């Protein structure tokens, strides 16, 4: 759904790291996906527009 | 002394830290210092002018 302001994940940074999704770990997350990294990534970005 | 090329810590990338000295943890090094890493970092400017 909408997105949060709980967390500064949005000032997450990494070296080398070239996708923005790339930066998080799912994996051990039973809740969440892939896709749900990317598809809350690019309703992050268009929040910038 | 000289600056070593070993590795790539002039990638090494963190968010909301402004002092590039600040990234690194001396702590469990008994061989180094914080003026080292200070006096290191000032040396890894200068390579870059």
């Known amino acids: 759904g ?3 302001g709980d967390k500064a994940y ?3 940074e990494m070296g ?3 996708a923005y999704d ?3 770990d799912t994996s ?3 809740d969440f ?3 749900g990294v ?3 990534s690019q309703q992050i970005a268009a929040v910038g527009g």
């Open 33 to 35: 996906n892939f896709v």
């Open 10 to 12: 949005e000032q997450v």
């Open 22 to 24: 790339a930066m998080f």
């Open 28 to 30: 051990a997350a039973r």
């Open 38 to 40: 990317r598809g809350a």
């Open 2 to 4: 909408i997105l949060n």
């Open 16 to 18: 080398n790291i070239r």
